[PDB]
Symmetry: C3
Subunit: 259 residues, 3 copies
């Protein structure tokens, strides 16, 4: 329940009694911080921030700061929604939404390495890793268990599928498909994120069905449109594969070129 005396916390900020705030941190008004959340030193939590339970914010992390959008109205009250059990490492930088009804949303059990960045209006699910120095532009969506490696940049309006991986230094300009590994500049889909599926304990049967789905899509000499139709006409598919199909059809920017 210990808070450092040299912390500047607004009277109105709704901090749970268990919460810890370190030296020279600054918490603004219109802030909710729930149970078990530990804040270190020099952390800034900006107005609009709704932080859940058992999160950690390491030194210099900056939460709910202004959108890096030159057309954004700074007098607006916009939000940063953060779930439970997230870790924000040193100088990680999370920006709030650009509209009253579009917050920046982070789920549970995500890990933001030092100096990593989440732009305005990003939506992240659960158990994601954003590695050191990686930057998401505004309006980037991650599903669950995505691994984004160091110094990656993700273009605005891209989706990153569940259990996908993006290697160091990759320039992502289109969607990263589920269960897949993306790499390079220009980046391409390399193949399956097998290591991630195994780590996640996917049965060999599911992993093979995911493999067959992408064999059809990417390794059968037919267009993506025809490949998706073939998969469906094939009969009853597992939900992972239905998810792959949906992901391809709903894609806004399109899906990263295959290598």
């Amino acid at each position: 329940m210990k808070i450092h005396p040299t912390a500047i916390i607004d009277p109105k900020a709704e901090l749970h009694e268990s919460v810890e705030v370190g030296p020279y941190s600054i918490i603004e008004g219109n802030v909710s911080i729930q149970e078990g959340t530990i804040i270190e030193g020099h952390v800034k939590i900006c107005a609009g921030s709704e932080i859940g339970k058992f999160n950690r914010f390491h030194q210099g992390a900056v939460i709910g700061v202004m959108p890096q959008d030159l057309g954004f109205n700074q007098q607006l009250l916009t939000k940063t929604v953060i779930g439970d059990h997230n870790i924000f490492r040193e100088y990680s930088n999370i920006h709030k939404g650009t509209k009253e009804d579009s917050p920046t949303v982070i789920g549970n059990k995500n890990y933001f390495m030092g100096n990593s960045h989440v732009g305005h209006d990003c939506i992240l699910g659960n158990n994601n890793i954003l590695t050191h120095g990686a930057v998401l532009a505004g309006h980037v969506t991650l599903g669950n268990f995505a691994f984004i490696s160091g110094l990656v940049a993700v273009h605005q309006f891209c989706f990153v599928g569940d259990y996908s991986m993006v290697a160091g230094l990759a320039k992502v300009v289109q969607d990263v498909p589920p269960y897949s590994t993306v790499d390079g500049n220009p980046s391409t889909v390399v193949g399956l994120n097998s290591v991630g599926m195994k780590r996640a304990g996917f049965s060999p049967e599911v992993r093979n069905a995911i493999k067959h789905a992408y064999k059809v899509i990417y390794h059968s000499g037919i267009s993506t449109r025809k490949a998706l139709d073939e998969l469906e006409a094939s009969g009853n598919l597992i939900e992972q594969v239905k998810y792959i199909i949906k992901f391809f059809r709903d894609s806004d920017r399109g899906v990263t070129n295959h290598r």
Copy 2:
């Protein structure tokens, strides 16, 4: 006119009366800060810094710090010259000059996104954008309205032309030509920065003349030297095109290869 009590500001620092300095910021001696400039928390403004009007320095921004030059004499009094209406985002990092008569110069209406870096002796004009995590080496020159995307690195002694764009993750080793888009590792000129010229309200006539100039240079099967001569012998050219020609001739490192 409000300054936070926990700020360490040198008595000699020349701050205007309107200026605002946030919690735990450190301003040194030999600092001039003009009217309307707002400084947030944990900002450091180093000796030699001449800051203009209506600038903003977000949390943790570091201004006029020592050159990352191992041969530089730290006892020297060198400057960081910053104009009006500039925005320096969280943990952005601006380094001072390496000589008494060569300051680091930033003009007006520039935007430095979080964790972006301007090396010693850089010269930047007006209305430029330095996107998140981007780094300019020492002695980098930007004109006006250059857009430099996220996690770009620019080599020392490169020039970046007006209304040019550099995409994520590009490794810039030679000049970025005016009105052009550069991308990749190794980077190349992709084509015209049409989006930027339109946004800037260039007439179709000017945009087409810029297009014709580069068609000759890059798309007519002739050497750059011959292409520039052809353009001039063509008669009276618009000033944008004369600027393109001058930019190519005055280039020190040469101009980025075309794709």
Copy 3:
């Protein structure tokens, strides 16, 4: 001998009397800082940190922070060993070891530019340069006089040889061989780091023997295995060349592909 009043330093921390600690810095218990070491503002030195003589830690540098390893036990007492005459620039980030008997080790006369990162269990020798925004993963080893340029990422378990260079933006996934230059994504060995060998004052005879060694390895139409055997059967070799041979044989991940 001057320490700022607003610094939070643990009573148990073993700081030499000459040491300087700037405003709003935080030093923890179980910290040794030797003679002549200057710390600026907002620097954090974490438990386990053994800092030598005449080092400098610029504003916001974070030393001995927790490993970015999700399987690491945070209750463990692990170390960060730093030698003499090192410079850590603004917001540079050094992480401690993951085991009691495996510290993170930095030698002497190294330079860590702003926002550069050394992951858990890295071993660095002397006179190395880690340029702005560059990131080393955990278990990265650098020898002596390695120059690592801006925004480079180095994969876990890679070795970087003496007097080697890695250009901006390079994605390093295998070893960087001694006296060599590595570049790109995917990165390759470009050739010899001649500039670095000359700067270091290598005689033309040694530089030529290094050149001949790599000519055999990389420019004689024979496998690396055969090339190394040929070099040895050639007779008495200089120690630089023996070092090249050893480096290739002892390599864990293998050595970066040649261009």
